[PDB]
Amino acid sequence: KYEITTIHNLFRKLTHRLFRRNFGYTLR
Amino acid sequence: VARGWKRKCPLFGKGG
Known part of the structure; x- marks a missing residue:
């Protein structure tokens, strides 16, 4: 759960x- | 900044 962590906050x-x-830019 | 993956929900951080 990443998108829902930076796009749901x-x-x-x-x-x-x-x-x-x-x-x-980090997980890149 | 990496405060929305560790501070918000300990899923990508603590759990990661």
Whole structure:
């Protein structure tokens, strides 16, 4: 559970972006 | 920043 951790916290209503645009630069 | 995967839910962090 990652996307729902960075896209459900404050991006619950924000196009899933921080998923790989914020937490993707690390797991890259 | 890595505070939304460890601080929010200990799934990707503690559990990871």
